[PDB]
Write an enzyme that holds these catalytic residues in place. Structure first.
Site, PDB file in Angstrom:
ATOM      1  N   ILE A 146     -23.219  -7.132   7.061  1.00 25.03           N
ATOM      2  CA  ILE A 146     -22.927  -5.310   7.399  1.00 25.03           C
ATOM      3  C   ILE A 146     -23.271  -4.851   8.684  1.00 25.03           C
ATOM      4  CG2 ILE A 146     -21.638  -4.688   5.158  1.00 25.03           C
ATOM      5  CD1 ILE A 146     -24.507  -3.575   3.984  1.00 25.03           C
ATOM      6  N   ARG A 182     -27.016  -5.181  11.817  1.00 30.78           N
ATOM      7  CA  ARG A 182     -28.058  -5.817  12.341  1.00 30.78           C
ATOM      8  C   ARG A 182     -29.322  -4.644  12.779  1.00 30.78           C
ATOM      9  NH1 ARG A 182     -28.692 -11.611  12.845  1.00 30.78           N
ATOM     10  NH2 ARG A 182     -26.016 -12.583  12.461  1.00 30.78           N
ATOM     11  N   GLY A 183     -30.258  -5.154  12.771  1.00 30.41           N
ATOM     12  CA  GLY A 183     -31.507  -3.890  13.908  1.00 30.41           C
ATOM     13  C   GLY A 183     -32.433  -5.537  14.947  1.00 30.41           C
ATOM     14  N   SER A 184     -33.602  -4.782  14.461  1.00 21.71           N
ATOM     15  CA  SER A 184     -34.945  -5.171  15.755  1.00 21.71           C
ATOM     16  C   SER A 184     -35.469  -6.491  14.198  1.00 21.71           C
ATOM     17  CB  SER A 184     -35.634  -4.096  15.476  1.00 21.71           C
ATOM     18  OG  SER A 184     -35.114  -4.045  16.894  1.00 21.71           O
ATOM     19  N   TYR A 185     -35.328  -5.776  13.124  1.00 22.12           N
ATOM     20  CA  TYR A 185     -35.738  -6.710  11.874  1.00 22.12           C
ATOM     21  C   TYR A 185     -34.870  -7.637  10.758  1.00 22.12           C
ATOM     22  CZ  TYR A 185     -40.829  -5.152  13.051  1.00 22.12           C
ATOM     23  OH  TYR A 185     -41.723  -5.365  13.768  1.00 22.12           O
ATOM     24  N   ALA A 186     -33.847  -6.500  10.427  1.00 22.06           N
ATOM     25  CA  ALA A 186     -32.977  -7.121   9.325  1.00 22.06           C
ATOM     26  C   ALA A 186     -31.677  -6.986   9.878  1.00 22.06           C
ATOM     27  CB  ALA A 186     -33.727  -6.148   8.361  1.00 22.06           C
ATOM     28  N   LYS A 187     -30.914  -8.695   9.668  1.00 17.21           N
ATOM     29  CA  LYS A 187     -29.850  -8.407   9.330  1.00 17.21           C
ATOM     30  C   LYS A 187     -29.420  -8.290   7.841  1.00 17.21           C
ATOM     31  CE  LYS A 187     -26.007 -12.281   8.602  1.00 17.21           C
ATOM     32  NZ  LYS A 187     -26.530 -14.746   8.617  1.00 17.21           N
ATOM     33  N   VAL A 188     -28.341  -7.513   7.934  1.00 15.39           N
ATOM     34  CA  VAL A 188     -27.938  -6.142   6.426  1.00 15.39           C
ATOM     35  C   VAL A 188     -26.874  -7.569   5.891  1.00 15.39           C
ATOM     36  CG1 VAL A 188     -27.498  -4.122   5.264  1.00 15.39           C
ATOM     37  CG2 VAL A 188     -29.724  -4.918   6.828  1.00 15.39           C
ATOM     38  N   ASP A 212     -39.108   8.555  12.058  1.00 18.12           N
ATOM     39  CA  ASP A 212     -37.596   8.095  12.580  1.00 18.12           C
ATOM     40  C   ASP A 212     -36.377   9.372  12.170  1.00 18.12           C
ATOM     41  OD1 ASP A 212     -36.543   6.610  14.672  1.00 18.12           O
ATOM     42  OD2 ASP A 212     -36.267   5.280  13.203  1.00 18.12           O
ATOM     43  N   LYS A 269     -32.587  10.819  12.571  1.00 17.20           N
ATOM     44  CA  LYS A 269     -32.329  10.500  14.562  1.00 17.20           C
ATOM     45  C   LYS A 269     -30.639  10.933  13.629  1.00 17.20           C
ATOM     46  CE  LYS A 269     -32.966   6.104  14.988  1.00 17.20           C
ATOM     47  NZ  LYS A 269     -32.564   5.396  15.838  1.00 17.20           N
ATOM     48  N   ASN A 306     -30.152   7.730  11.433  1.00 20.42           N
ATOM     49  CA  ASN A 306     -30.928   7.313  10.328  1.00 20.42           C
ATOM     50  C   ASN A 306     -30.315   8.405   8.951  1.00 20.42           C
ATOM     51  OD1 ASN A 306     -32.122   5.043  11.354  1.00 20.42           O
ATOM     52  ND2 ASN A 306     -33.970   5.898  11.417  1.00 20.42           N
TER      53      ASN A 306
HETATM   54  N1  LIG Z   1     -28.292   1.079   2.459  1.00 22.89           N
HETATM   55  C1  LIG Z   1     -28.248   0.264   3.385  1.00 22.89           C
HETATM   56  N2  LIG Z   1     -26.424   0.816   3.202  1.00 22.89           N
HETATM   57  C2  LIG Z   1     -25.139   0.234   3.744  1.00 22.89           C
HETATM   58  N3  LIG Z   1     -25.954   0.039   5.365  1.00 22.89           N
HETATM   59  C3  LIG Z   1     -27.189  -0.133   5.700  1.00 22.89           C
HETATM   60  C4  LIG Z   1     -28.370  -0.054   4.438  1.00 22.89           C
HETATM   61  N4  LIG Z   1     -29.559  -0.410   5.551  1.00 22.89           N
HETATM   62  C5  LIG Z   1     -29.636  -0.583   6.348  1.00 22.89           C
HETATM   63  N5  LIG Z   1     -27.335  -0.728   7.068  1.00 22.89           N
HETATM   64  C6  LIG Z   1     -26.469  -0.728   8.014  1.00 22.89           C
HETATM   65  O1  LIG Z   1     -27.629  -2.024   9.222  1.00 22.89           O
HETATM   66  C7  LIG Z   1     -27.803  -1.205   9.349  1.00 22.89           C
HETATM   67  C8  LIG Z   1     -28.717  -2.470  10.378  1.00 22.89           C
HETATM   68  O2  LIG Z   1     -30.531  -1.245   9.488  1.00 22.89           O
HETATM   69  P1  LIG Z   1     -31.789  -1.120   9.696  1.00 22.89           P
HETATM   70  O3  LIG Z   1     -31.639  -0.142  11.292  1.00 22.89           O
HETATM   71  O4  LIG Z   1     -32.179  -0.527   8.385  1.00 22.89           O
HETATM   72  O5  LIG Z   1     -32.577  -2.129  10.239  1.00 22.89           O
HETATM   73  P2  LIG Z   1     -33.992  -3.062  10.674  1.00 22.89           P
HETATM   74  O6  LIG Z   1     -33.989  -4.013  11.537  1.00 22.89           O
HETATM   75  O7  LIG Z   1     -34.637  -2.376   9.160  1.00 22.89           O
HETATM   76  O8  LIG Z   1     -34.852  -1.543  11.402  1.00 22.89           O
HETATM   77  P3  LIG Z   1     -34.920  -0.933  12.872  1.00 22.89           P
HETATM   78  O9  LIG Z   1     -33.715  -1.866  13.882  1.00 22.89           O
HETATM   79  O10 LIG Z   1     -35.347   0.057  13.145  1.00 22.89           O
HETATM   80  O11 LIG Z   1     -36.019  -1.916  13.466  1.00 22.89           O
HETATM   81  C9  LIG Z   1     -27.812  -0.055  10.014  1.00 22.89           C
HETATM   82  O12 LIG Z   1     -28.067   0.597  10.601  1.00 22.89           O
HETATM   83  C10 LIG Z   1     -26.751   0.576   8.562  1.00 22.89           C
HETATM   84  O13 LIG Z   1     -25.807   0.024   9.515  1.00 22.89           O
END
Ligand SMILES: Nc1ncnc2c1ncn2[C@@H]1O[C@H](COP(=O)(O)OP(=O)(O)OP(=O)(O)O)[C@@H](O)[C@H]1O
Length: 328
Positions: free
Chosen positions: A15, A17-23, A129, A131, A134
Site C-alpha cells: 500500500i 513506500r517511503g524512504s524507510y518502509a515498505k508498507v 513533520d 504537513k 502526514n
Molecule cells: N497506518 C497506515 N495506514 C495506511 N497506510 C499507511 C500507514 N502508514 C503509512 N502508510 C502508507 O505508506 C506510505 C509510506 O509510509 P511512511 O511515509 O510513514 O514511510 P517511511 O519510510 O516510514 O517514512 P519516511 O519516508 O518519512 O522516511 C504513507 O504515505 C501511506 O500512504
C-alpha cells in the site's frame, strides 16, 4: 500462544513506500483483524531511528488521533511494525479535490490535530513533520497523524533541541534562524497547514528563497476569510515563537482552546470522537485499497528475496529486544 512473527500474518497488499518502509496491508490470522505493517530492512538501520519510532508509536497507541502500535517483530533481514490501518486517504489528496475547505471543516481538522500534537507534547515529543500528506483520514473521517520519523522524544520542562529538519514549506523560523527550539515548531506548522486548508495554497506560494520568504516577508491573509480565521492564522504564524499561539510555556494548549476561532469546539466531545466529521471518506475496493496509489497496490504481494552478501554483514545484536506486543 507464542510471540508474533511473520508466520502469523497473511500479506494482503502493498500500500505504500517511503524512504524507510515498505508498507503492507496484512491480516493477523488467528484474530481475523487487519493492520498496516511497516517493513524496514535492517541494512537501512545498522541507527536509533529504531528506538524513536518504537517509543513514539508506543507513547502514542490508543490515542484517537495518532497511529498506534499493535506489535513489532523481526526476521533475519527485516524489522516489522504492525500498526493501525488508516484507509480514508489523507489531507493532501483531499485538498486537491476540495481545492479549499470551509472554515468549519478546517476548524474540525485543526482541532483533532491540535489534540494529537498536545498529547505528543505532554509526553515530551516534538512531531516535527506536520504537513498535509502526514494527516491521514480514517474510514469515518477522523484524522490520524502518521510518520514519526522526524520526531524528537525527550523534552522535560522548557528544554530544547537543535536539529535542522522538517519539510521545507512547513519549517518554523526558529529552526531557520538556527535557534534552539521546543514544541513551538509544531504550532507554526499547524498555522501553515490551516492556511493551506482555508486558502488552498501555501502561504509561501529556490529553496534558499523559500527560506527567505518564511523569514522576512509578511503573510498575506486572503480577503475572503472570516475575521476569526485571519486572527488564528496570524496568531499561529507569528514569526516569534515566544509570541506564537500555543507556545506560551504553561497555558499553550489552553490558549488554543480559548481562541475565538475555536469557540464552537467541544474539546471533550472531540477527544472522544463524538463530533460527526464534516466529510465521510469513500471506501471503495477491497479494504478500501482504492485510497492507495495503484503503483503500490499493483505490486506483487511479497517481500523481496534476501541477498546473503548483504544479510550476512548485519550485526543482529543491534536488534535484540525489538519484539513487542501491545498490552491492551
Ligand atoms: N497506518 C497506515 N495506514 C495506511 N497506510 C499507511 C500507514 N502508514 C503509512 N502508510 C502508507 O505508506 C506510505 C509510506 O509510509 P511512511 O511515509 O510513514 O514511510 P517511511 O519510510 O516510514 O517514512 P519516511 O519516508 O518519512 O522516511 C504513507 O504515505 C501511506 O500512504
Amino acid at each position: 500462544m507464542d510471540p508474533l512473527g511473520l508466520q502469523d500474518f497473511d500479506l494482503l497488499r502493498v500500500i505504500g513506500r517511503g524512504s524507510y518502509a515498505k508498507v503492507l496491508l496484512v491480516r493477523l490470522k488467528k484474530t481475523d483483524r487487519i493492520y498496516a505493517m511497516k517493513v524496514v530492512k535492517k541494512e537501512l538501520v545498522n541507527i536509533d531511528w529504531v528506538q524513536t519510532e518504537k517509543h513514539v508509536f508506543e507513547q502514542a497507541s490508543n490515542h484517537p488521533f495518532l497511529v498506534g502500535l499493535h506489535s513489532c517483530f523481526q526476521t533475519e533481514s527485516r524489522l516489522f511494525f504492525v500498526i493501525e490501518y488508516v484507509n480514508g486517504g489523507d489531507l493532501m489528496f483531499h485538498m486537491q479535490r476540495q481545492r479549499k475547505l470551509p472554515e468549519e471543516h478546517a476548524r474540525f481538522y485543526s482541532a483533532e490535530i491540535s489534540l494529537a500534537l498536545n498529547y505528543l507534547h505532554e509526553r515530551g515529543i516534538i512531531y516535527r513533520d506536520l504537513k498535509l500528506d502526514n494527516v491521514l483520514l480514517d474510514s469515518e473521517g477522523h484524522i490520524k497523524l502518521t510518520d514519526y520519523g522526524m520526531c524528537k522524544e525527550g523534552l522535560r520542562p522548557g528544554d530544547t533541541t537543535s536539529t535542522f529538519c522538517g519539510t521545507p514549506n512547513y519549517i518554523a523560523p526558529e529552526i531557520l534562524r538556527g535557534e534552539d527550539y521546543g514544541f513551538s515548531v509544531d504550532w507554526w506548522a499547524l498555522g501553515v497547514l490551516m492556511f493551506e486548508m482555508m486558502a488552498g495554497r501555501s502561504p509561501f506560494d529556490t529553496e534558499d528563497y523559500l527560506f527567505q520568504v518564511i523569514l522576512e516577508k509578511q503573510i498575506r491573509i486572503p480577503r475572503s476569510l472570516s475575521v476569526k480565521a485571519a486572527s488564528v492564522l496570524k496568531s499561529f504564524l507569528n514569526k516569534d515563537p515566544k509570541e506564537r499561539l500555543g507556545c506560551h510555556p504553561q497555558t499553550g494548549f489552553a490558549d488554543i482552546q480559548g481562541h475565538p476561532f475555536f469557540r464552537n469546539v467541544d474539546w471533550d466531545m472531540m477527544e472522544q470522537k463524538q463530533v460527526v466529521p464534516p466529510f465521510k471518506p469513500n471506501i471503495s475496493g477491497e479494504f478500501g485499497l482504492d485510497n492507495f496509489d495503484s503503483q503500490f497496490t499493483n505490486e506483487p504481494v511479497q517481500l523481496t528475496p534476501d541477498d546473503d552478501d548483504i544479510v550476512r554483514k548485519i550485526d543482529q545484536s543491534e536488534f535484540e529486544g525489538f519484539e513487542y506486543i501491545n498490552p491492551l
